[PDB]
Design a protein around this ligand. Structure first.
Ligand SMILES: [Zn+2]
Lengths: 92, 49, 48, 146, 215
């Protein structure tokens, strides 16, 4: 977490406190650190079907797409798109 | 630099295939008289002629 | 001629099938292509 | 933590999607994977190709590997220039493969078939072959040219 | 997960295709409908109504036919069973041996699940009149002989053998060899000293043949 302790100013390492508490203190120097710790580092096509997407939607109209996937004997997978929301959908 | 490298390749490639011939049985055989191939190139015709 | 498998002649059919495949096949195709080449020149005289 | 694999294999260094033939499309992959990416669903594995023939021997083996090694040798040598002819190539790949395993031309791999100690101590070796043949009390014969 | 599970049932289904067409070219008797089925009939047969497939019920039996028992005088029907758990060891292999004991035949073959350990290696290859075979589910998806470069490998009897040696007048062995435990070798289950005729096609004169024995 890369912290430090004023005065001596070396480093702060987490040490296990007795009976339930987790603390941290500077090495070789007396100190105690209370608080919460934190760190962070970083269209023409149309078809007729029922739309599963529901807010007010309940849309009748939809889009579809066709391609052959996986094995030759494996059936066709279709891709549905909705007019109102513009949601992509996929099922075989 | 390429001049010195020229000799090594052909040499080591030779010493493997060095002993081989074609008998009157039309089969190309080795020094141990083991048959590596029944007919040369699957044809038996020489690219020289 | 023809030799089927081991010590047996073939009959009338496998000539086209040719799953037995003895060697000398290079000798047959040479005579074949040579014959059909003359045919191509012969059939050219036909249209002419 | 921000390392470990979520999906895919532990092989490929990278892949590429390229335009195949005239107008068609396909991909080429760099890795040792082979069968696993062939077993990988979504692609037809019937017609494929792979380099470093030795590993092709670990899957298809023998014949198919011999057919592949004469395929690459012919290719790369048909570009830069001249011609080596089809005949001389097939014999090179056959004498390597015929034993049932791909090996040869190197001192570690040149001891496979030949039992002649003098020609092997000729090409490359000095001390070992002379003492080894004496230890095991080998005999062999004087046959070959060298 | 519905997604990845259906990937595996399609795997096993195509894996069932592999072991099927494999038992056919050995000379054993099946039909074109046996190796050819869509996903429909597969889901009915070996998969429950709950949606989860099964294991042990996939086991079947097949025999040879006509020339298979003529060409090769010594042979017969075999018995194939499947595995259960990814962990090997004795377990069901005991009764598997027992199954081979009273039911005789030739070679019990079983497709693995995931891992192999020396436990199951306790005794694999002893049923002294016969033997067995080991196959991994992973390695088996599509057939290798049908793939690209691998040509047709034709196994022949002892008859054709001695005649082939009477052609060029040769002592035995000494021919171009073929290793065993080779994925193609073990595929057809070749024993010691078995010649297999190979028809290969490359372009010079085109089609030509060569012989390779099995060490
Ligand atoms: Zn401090």
């Amino acid at each position: 977490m890369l912290s430090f302790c004023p005065s001596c100013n070396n480093m702060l390492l987490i040490t296990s406190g007795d009976s339930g508490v987790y603390t941290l203190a500077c090495r070789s120097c007396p100190y105690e650190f209370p608080i919460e710790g934190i760190e962070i580092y970083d269209n023409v096509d149309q078809t007729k079907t029922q739309c599963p997407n529901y807010d007010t939607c309940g849309g009748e109209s939809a889009y579809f797409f066709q391609l052959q996937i996986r094995s030759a004997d494996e059936p066709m997978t279709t891709f549905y798109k909705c007019v109102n929301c513009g949601h992509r959908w996929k099922e075989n | 630099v390429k001049t010195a490298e020229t000799g090594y390749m052909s040499r080591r490639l030779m010493k493997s295939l060095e002993d081989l011939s074609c008998q009157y049985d039309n089969t190309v055989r080795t020094s141990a008289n083991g048959i590596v191939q029944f007919t040369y190139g699957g044809d038996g015709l020489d690219p020289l002629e | 001629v023809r030799y089927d498998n081991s010590g047996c002649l073939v009959k009338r059919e496998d000539l086209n099938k040719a799953e037995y495949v003895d060697q000398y096949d290079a000798e047959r195709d040479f005579y074949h292509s040579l014959r059909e080449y003359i045919n191509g020149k012969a059939t050219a005289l036909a249209n002419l | 933590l921000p390392d470990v694999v979520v999906k895919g294999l532990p092989d490929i260094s990278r892949a590429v999607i390229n335009i195949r033939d005239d107008g068609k499309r396909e991909l080429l992959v760099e890795g040792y994977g082979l069968r696993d990416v062939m077993c990988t669903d979504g692609v037809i594995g019937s017609r494929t190709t792979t380099n470093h023939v030795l590993e092709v021997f670990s899957v298809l083996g023998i014949e198919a590997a011999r057919y592949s090694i004469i395929r690459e040798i012919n290719y790369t040598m048909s570009n830069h220039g001249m011609s080596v002819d089809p005949r001389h190539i097939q014999l090179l790949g056959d004498v390597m493969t015929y034993k049932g395993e791909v090996l040869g031309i190197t001192r570690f791999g040149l001891s496979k078939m030949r039992d002649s100690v003098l020609q092997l101590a000729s090409f490359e070796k000095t001390t070992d072959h002379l003492f080894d043949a004496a230890f095991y009390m080998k005999k062999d014969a004087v046959e070959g040219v060298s | 997960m519905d997604q990845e599970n259906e990937r595996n049932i399609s795997r096993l289904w195509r894996a069932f295709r592999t072991v099927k067409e494999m038992v056919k070219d050995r000379g054993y008797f099946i039909t074109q409908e046996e190796v050819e089925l869509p996903l429909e009939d597969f889901k009915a047969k070996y998969c429950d109504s709950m949606g989860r497939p099964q294991r042990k019920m996939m086991s079947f039996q097949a025999n040879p036919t006509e020339e298979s028992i003529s060409k090769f005088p010594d042979m017969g029907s075999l018995w194939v069973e499947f595995c259960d758990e990814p962990s090997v060891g004795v377990k069901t292999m005991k009764t598997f041996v027992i199954h081979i004991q009273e039911k005789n035949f030739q070679t019990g073959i079983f497709v693995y699940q995931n891992n192999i350990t020396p436990s199951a290696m306790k005794l694999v290859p002893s049923i002294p009149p016969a033997t067995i075979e080991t196959f991994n589910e992973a390695a088996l998806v599509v057939n290798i002989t049908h793939h690209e470069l691998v040509p047709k490998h034709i196994r022949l009897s002892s008859d054709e053998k001695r005649e082939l040696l009477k052609r060029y007048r040769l002592k035995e062995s000494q021919l171009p060899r073929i290793q065993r435990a080779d994925p193609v070798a073990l595929y057809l289950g070749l024993k010691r000293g078995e010649v297999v005729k190979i028809i290969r096609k490359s372009e010079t004169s085109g089609r030509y043949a060569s012989y390779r024995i099995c060490m």
